[PDB]
Amino acid sequence: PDQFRAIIESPEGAGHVGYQYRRNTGSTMRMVSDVLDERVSLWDFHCDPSGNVIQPGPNVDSRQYLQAAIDYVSSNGGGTITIPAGYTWYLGSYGVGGIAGHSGIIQLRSNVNLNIEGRIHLSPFFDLKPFQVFVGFDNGDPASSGNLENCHIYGHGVVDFGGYEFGASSQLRNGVAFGRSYNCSVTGITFQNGDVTWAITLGWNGYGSNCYVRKCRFINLVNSSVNADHSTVYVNCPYSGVESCYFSMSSSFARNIACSVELHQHDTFYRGSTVNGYCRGAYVVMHAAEAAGAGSYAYNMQVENNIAVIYGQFVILGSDVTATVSGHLNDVIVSGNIVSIGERAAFSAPFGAFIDIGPDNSGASNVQDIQRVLVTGNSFYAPANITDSAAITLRANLNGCTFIANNFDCRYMVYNAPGTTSPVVQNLVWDKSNVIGGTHANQRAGQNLFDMQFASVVNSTIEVQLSCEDLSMFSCILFPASCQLSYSKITVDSAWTKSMSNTAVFEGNQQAGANVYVSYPATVNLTSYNTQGAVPFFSTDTNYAWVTSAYSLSINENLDFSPPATYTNKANGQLVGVGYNEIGGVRSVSVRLMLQRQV
Numbered sequence: 253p254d255q256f257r258a259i260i261e262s263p264e265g266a267g268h269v270g271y272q273y274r275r276n277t278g279s280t281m282r283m284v285s286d287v288l289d290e291r292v293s294l295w296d297f298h299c300d301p302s303g304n305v306i307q308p309g310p311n312v313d314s315r316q317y318l319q320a321a322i323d324y325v326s327s328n329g330g331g332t333i334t335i336p337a338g339y340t341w342y343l344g345s346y347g348v349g350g351i352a353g354h355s356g357i358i359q360l361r362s363n364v365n366l367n368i369e370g371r372i373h374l375s376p377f378f379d380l381k382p383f384q385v386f387v388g389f390d391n392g393d394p395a396s397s398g399n400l401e402n403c404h405i406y407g408h409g410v411v412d413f414g415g416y417e418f419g420a421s422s423q424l425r426n427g428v429a430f431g432r433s434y435n436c437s438v439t440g441i442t443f444q445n446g447d448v449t450w451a452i453t454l455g456w457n458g459y460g461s462n463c464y465v466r467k468c469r470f471i472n473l474v475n476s477s478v479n480a481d482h483s484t485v486y487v488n489c490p491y492s493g494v495e496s497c498y499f500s501m502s503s504s505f506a507r508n509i510a511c512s513v514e515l516h517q518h519d520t521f522y523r524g525s526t527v528n529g530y531c532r533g534a535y536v537v538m539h540a541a542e543a544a545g546a547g548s549y550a551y552n553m554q555v556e557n558n559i560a561v562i563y564g565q566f567v568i569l570g571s572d573v574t575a576t577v578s579g580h581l582n583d584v585i586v587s588g589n590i591v592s593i594g595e596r597a598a599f600s601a602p603f604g605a606f607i608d609i610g611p612d613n614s615g616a617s618n619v620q621d622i623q624r625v626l627v628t629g630n631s632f633y634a635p636a637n638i639t640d641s642a643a644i645t646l647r648a649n650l651n652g653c654t655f656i657a658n659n660f661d662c663r664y665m666v667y668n669a670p671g672t673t674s675p676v677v678q679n680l681v682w683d684k685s686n687v688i689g690g691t692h693a694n695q696r697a698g699q700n701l702f703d704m705q706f707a708s709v710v711n712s713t714i715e716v717q718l719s720c721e722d723l724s725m726f727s728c729i730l731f732p733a734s735c736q737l738s739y740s741k742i743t744v745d746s747a748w749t750k751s752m753s754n755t756a757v758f759e760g761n762q763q764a765g766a767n768v769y770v771s772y773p774a775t776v777n778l779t780s781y782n783t784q785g786a787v788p789f790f791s792t793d794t795n796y797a798w799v800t801s802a803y804s805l806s807i808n809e810n811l812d813f814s815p816p817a818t819y820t821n822k823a824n825g826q827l828v829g830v831g832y833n834e835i836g837g838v839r840s841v842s843v844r845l846m847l848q849r850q851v
């Protein structure tokens with residue numbers, strides 16, 4: 253019986269105290285230790301070599317204890333380790349083995365979940381150094397890594413990166429790198445107070461599946477000029493995504509460098525999230541260099557129902573090539589998003605845009621294969637002073653993009669800078685249902701609303717519809733002579749255009765092409781013959797050999813005659829129509845006409 257007291261006070265004591273659930277005689281006859289063994293926390297590994305519990309704190313490195321916990325739970329086939337609430341657990345050294353090649357702190361393991369209720373902080377050992385806090389690779393070479401499966405990080409807790417700046421721009425810093433990750437997720441967690449490259453990365457070069465980031469917060473994760481680049485979540489495996497997250501930055505640097513999400517593989521999504529203070533919303537890109545695990549195509553890409561205040565571009569599309577692989581981007585939907593460029597000076601951050609068709613990382617604009625994109629049902633706003641704002645900046649080759657039923661209220665609709673790239677454009681469709689706002693009315697001196705600074709345009713549709721006047725603009729749409737135009741439809745609705753000197757401008761007279769379908773308003777001077785009765789009127793200019801019909805947009809202030817309501821052309825490039833002289837006499841009028849070709 254001395255034995256007994258001793259057994260009870262020993263670490264095996266709970267293993268000697270019997271228990272049966274709710275006194276139910278049909279329940280298992282267990283011991284207390286069995287029931288306690290159904291859960292596990294960091295406290296069960298956070299101890300010195302004699303087994304005495306160690307209190308966490310800024311002078312204690314909790315890393316080895318958390319790794320021991322993960323290692324042990326993995327050995328039993330998995331479970332969930334709680335990181336207790338009411339404590340801050342500091343990490344103060346690098347991990348060892350396969351994660352050392354990734355500057356890893358903690359190695360995640362398959363089927364071992366982390367329920368983070370307390371706080372995890374980085375100690376100043378990490379100041380000016382690279383780190384990846386949680387790493388799912390098991391090898392320094394990702395190509396030689398095994399997988400991470402069934403690993404979930406969740407809870408009301410916090411990962412705090414200590415505020416430390418990067419030491420050098422070439423360093424990398426990450427929160428969670430799941431690795432070659434299958435059915436992994438982060439839910440509920442706040443990531444805050446750092447200068448990092450990513451908070452979370454999913455997958456590796458297409459290897460992984462079913463990874464998600466849901467109801468997380470990312471707060472103030474760029475803080476220095478050293479930080480080369482930041483994207484909060486990088487989605488690098490298919491069938492994966494980001495939903496219902498919150499992203500906020502306060503740094504000036506973040507306005508120029510930070511992006512919320514990147515979607516880099518097929519069947520990926522970014523939904524229902526709120527962004528503030530970032531340069532960019534999402535990249536949707538197929539990099540050939542990342543094509544190993546899931547193929548060379550990024551398809552079924554979804555960006556929907558987000559709310560954003562950004563300083564650069566909302567969605568950026570891309571694809572590129574390596575020596576032996578070609579990347580393609582297709583079957584994309586961008587819908588339901590409400591986005592604005594935040595208050596800033598013109599040209600003070602990267603050029604503002606809803607959609608950007610961007611060149612590759614080496615600036616090449618002739619490698620892209622981007623098509624079958626639908627942009628529908630979004631709003632975009634930029635304040636009136638922001639000259640550098642567009643619905644699309646089309647800066648690299650485009651094989652198709654469709655715009656239906658958006659509301660764009662910014663400086664430009666379509667833009668590319670002249671004397672830069674000369675993109676080859678196919679299948680650009682701008683439906684009439686896109687509503688062009690008026691915030692930038694009167695700011696457009698010298699500017700074309702649709703500034704078609706391309707090598708060529710084919711199989712494209714631009715149906716311009718104004719909803720207010722802006723007589724400051726040079727034109728609604730302009731094609732330089734260097735842009736070929738063919739098999740396209742270009743129209744300018746007449747509403748709010750009566751007073752415009754130029755509506756559509758074709759500097760190479762490209763509207764004469766055999767398969768160009770156009771219509772736009774123009775002012776035309778006409779003279780008639782002197783005959784009483786039905787009498788022809790003819791334009792004084794001869795630049796209408798391309799016109800198939802025209803009709804009056806002007807009232808007739810005369811009693812004694814009327815000009816033709818409608819006109820055809822003649823071989824010499826005059827317009828001609830049949831009007832009516834009640835009394836004879838040569839007539840001379842200026843009239844606003846709708847000029848039409850093959851429409």
Ligand SMILES: CC(=O)N[C@@H]1[C@@H](O[C@H]2O[C@H](CO)[C@H](O[C@H]3O[C@H](CO[C@@H]4O[C@@H](C)[C@H](O)[C@@H](O)[C@H]4O)[C@@H](O)[C@H](O)[C@H]3O)[C@H](O[C@@H]3O[C@H](CO)[C@@H](O)[C@H](O)[C@H]3NC(C)=O)[C@H]2O)[C@H](O)[C@@H](CO)O[C@H]1O
Binds near residue numbers: 514
């Ligand atoms: C910040 C960001 O995401 N920017 C986007 C561009 O990403 C490219 O540039 C970034 C710059 O940070 C990344 O390149 C850096 O990192 C890679 C990868 O790090 C190695 O492999 C890790 C698995 C490992 O843990 C590390 O220890 C490193 O060994 C490095 O190779 C580059 O030298 C370095 O500049 C990014 O790389 C991808 O990163 C994701 C997420 O971690 C990985 O899954 C991919 O495997 C990496 N891809 C490649 C080809 O290596 C670069 O792809 C991006 O291109 C553009 C367009 O979408 O947008 C930027 O915002």
Ligand code: NA
Binds near residue numbers: 353354355392
């Ligand atoms: Na590495």
Ligand code: NA
Binds near residue numbers: 659
């Ligand atoms: Na509106």
Ligand code: NA
Binds near residue numbers: 706707734735736
């Ligand atoms: Na050209």
